[PDB]
Design a protein around this ligand. Structure first.
Ligand SMILES: Nc1ncnc2c1ncn2[C@@H]1O[C@H](CSCC[C@H](N)C(=O)O)[C@@H](O)[C@H]1O
Ligand SMILES: Nc1ncnc2c1ncn2[C@@H]1O[C@H](CSCC[C@H](N)C(=O)O)[C@@H](O)[C@H]1O
Ligand SMILES: [Cl-]
Lengths: 451, 447
């Protein structure tokens, strides 16, 4: 990220503003509300500074820039119409390692001032960092509608209750379940906004009195095929609240940036199946919230059954959030609809390699009026070509390989069945093989990109 | 306001973390993402730190806390398990005037680290001062729902574009109208994420050429099978930005309660309307420069006639895109604990509809999972034919109605009972056939 947002405590720490105009006034108001020991140093001051100094709220220094005035400071704002003066200020703050802002120069200096949405003690800060101020206000105003008025009271009462919550509940898990119930209690919100104390207490006493679930849980989340926008809402809620995230090769970096930063992540790519079973089973033993994060959907060739089969008997609660399967994702982003009129009456999702022995029922796969979708069949492309032709499938039946479907690295190569072998050589895992006449619809429905 | 939020530029600035365990590792990652020149002081390090140190990404100093490591620093963090050490670190930084955070302790620290939504250069940070970290997590979840991943890309592009926003827009009011269709034109967003620097121009000048009130595009969106949680992020973002939503019965009211309240709605499903009228409505309301959203149950490209609706629009030069969804098979499989595949039970899943004729011997072959969409009526003759073509009569069968919804009914049993069990349900329902249906007695977590 281009900036690290932090929330400074300014009470009784000195700060310098240099400059004394309408801009300098706005920043000075911000620093005064935050309880800072302020010095303004300018050649002339608009009247608002004159009144603030009368009431003993800041110190005024009339004259040119005095570097020594930095010596005690935690923040400097350069706020004059003289670039030469502003840079001297920025250069003095840099030698003293003091974060400095220049109002005329977002790209110079050390910090940027964001727009603020006050719901004290709740604060949301927005900034596009100077590139877009329009999107800042557009975002700021939209955020202003989403956050209720009484959100401040809930948050103020939450802090007052924080001591009582730490003595009464022992572990971290049950304080979490307390706070989750607390912040979605609309009755408790209206009672605070109505200053009705008897009703605040009644609801508070009942909450402290509820037995809390000590058990851990495991949730199988389908991560979808790659684009981070194809995750489901439910699946975002799970990885934004999870304690541990067990993920594998086929979950993208964009999806992983959506995990809660203070959760631990275990990798299981390249590890076999019975180990994943136990590591899940082990991390759920600590009574934590375990997310098993799987590419695609977890019941389409992800062996989500094997994982959950252990835990029906080991008394662990579990559930599953479905995901966009690679087939649905690659079809929408390749322009290739999986069904269409009666091009296809059915769609077959097939595995590329079986349990050592056992042959695919090629007679069945060769049937007409169906879209064929081979999962992990790349290394067996040539034999699928042979066998399909052996069992009746025509020769000019179109085919497409969608490598890395739904990401920004998506390649699509197409052709006819007799080219299936050579098409596979110019693609790499992870790839899908689509076979059927719906592939011809591509040159009319491709909206994603010319690679 | 007793904390002032500032956005710090940390690239190439000395920053200090004291502590070498898991919490330090999460703060070190955070500060490494932002380009800090980072040192880490600890009596020992978890391996992840020795890795970062070998890739030359930070510096490790093993030993007790040395307050001289603060000599050239801009931010400090206490992240050890020892309150004595954290207090020492906290006190070494206040006399130097280095802003400092104590992970263990919001109070007794000169700065608090908020929750962040990163869309660089666009950033959103949420805190409530240590009072309510769960409530900030809840705010962060919602904000991540609402902001497209690639918004930062378009944020940036707007940068060297403010040039042209004046020599082709005079008033600040129209200037903002343009800016408003800019940040919501996902065709530009995808074009920038995919580096296709010609789809970017073709849409940059279409934005300066087309009338200011024209934003005409169509977005096919999968509603999913019924549960409002099963919508996609991009799906939700799209129905927040819609001028019109054209929807049918197969879209649940939970999903419709997510659609912006100041948006036109055309109900197009049935009452008690052929495909081509739906095509004309979409075409019609798109030529008027309105941002159209076609909302369809499940997934648009699986028995949704999604293909038909988009070849009406490819004639008239109307931009479009498709946000896929959870088809009924996936949902109903998950919310009934019947996985479509499991071990070597089934080499293939078959999603089938219920002119021409269905190939019967194919449907009976072993090592399959049959899923019948729109098949409740033909359900009688389906049990006859599968038996007549050699499928074992003890083949488990299940019918899932209103899958993934708070009124979901599941009915299971055996293929011999197939005709009896299909009376006990109503559309919308799924017929699932195969040996995986026997797994529900161990995997059903919904009911
Ligand atoms: N983004 C993608 N593009 C193309 N193929 C993909 C893909 N993601 C997964 N696959 C295919 O899926 C195989 C793993 S099987 C697991 C996939 C999961 N059951 C699902 O529903 O998607 C890979 O070998 C690859 O062939
Ligand atoms: N919530 C639900 N529960 C059970 N079946 C459903 C369902 N929603 C859709 N269906 C099935 O899907 C059929 C609608 S036609 C296709 C639906 C959608 N395109 C999808 O991807 O699912 C119905 O006849 C029914 O069989
Ligand atoms: Cl907080």
């Amino acid at each position: 990220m281009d900036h690290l947002p932090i929330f400074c405590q300014l009470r009784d720490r000195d700060c310098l503003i240099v400059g004394g105009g309408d801009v300098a006034e706005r920043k000075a108001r911000l620093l005064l509300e935050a309880g800072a020991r302020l010095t303004v140093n300018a050649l002339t001051f608009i009247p608002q500074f004159t009144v603030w100094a009368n009431e003993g709220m800041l110190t005024l220094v009339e004259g040119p820039f005095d570097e020594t005035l930095l010596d005690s400071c935690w923040l400097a704002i350069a706020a004059t119409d003289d670039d030469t003066v502003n840079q001297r200020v920025s250069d003095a703050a840099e030698s003293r390692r003091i974060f400095c802002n220049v109002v005329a120069a977002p790209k110079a200096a050390s910090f940027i001032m964001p727009s603020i949405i006050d719901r004290s003690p709740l604060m949301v800060a927005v900034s596009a960092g100077g590139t877009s101020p329009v999107l800042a206000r557009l975002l700021r105003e939209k955020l202003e509608s989403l956050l209720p008025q009484h959100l401040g009271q809930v948050a103020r009462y939450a802090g007052q209750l924080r001591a009582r919550v730490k003595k009464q509940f022992a572990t971290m898990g049950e304080r979490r379940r307390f706070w989750e119930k607390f912040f979605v209690n609309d009755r408790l919100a209206q009672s605070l906004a109505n200053a009705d104390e008897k009703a605040v207490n009644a609801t508070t006493e009942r909450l402290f009195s509820e037995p809390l679930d000590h058990r851990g849980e495991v949730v199988l989340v389908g991560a979808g095929p790659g684009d981070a926008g194809l995750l489901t809402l439910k699946g975002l809620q799970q990885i934004q609240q999870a304690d541990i995230v067990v993920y594998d090769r086929l979950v993208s970096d964009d999806i992983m940036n959506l995990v809660r930063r203070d959760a631990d992540r275990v990798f299981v790519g390249k590890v076999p199946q019975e180990e994943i079973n136990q590591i899940l089973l082990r991390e759920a033993q600590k009574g934590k919230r375990v997310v098993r994060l799987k590419g695609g959907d977890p019941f389409i060739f992800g062996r989500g059954g094997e994982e959950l089969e252990t835990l029906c008997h080991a008394g662990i609660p579990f559930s599953v959030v479905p995901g966009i399967t690679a087939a649905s994702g690659c079809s929408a982003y390749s322009g290739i609809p999986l069904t269409h009129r009666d091009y296809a009456q059915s769609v077959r999702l097939v595995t590329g390699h079986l349990k050592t022995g056992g042959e695919l029922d090629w007679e069945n796969l060769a049937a007409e009026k169906q879209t064929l979708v081979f999962y992990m069949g790349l290394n067996q492309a040539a034999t699928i070509q042979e066998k399909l032709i052996a069992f009746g499938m025509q020769a000019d039946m179109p085919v497409a390989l969608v490598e890395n479907g739904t990401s920004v690295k998506q390649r699509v190569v197409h052709g006819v069945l007799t080219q299936l072998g050579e098409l596979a050589q110019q693609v790499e895992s992870p790839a899908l093989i689509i076979v059927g006449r719906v592939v011809a619809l591509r040159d009319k429905l491709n909206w994603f990109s010319n690679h």
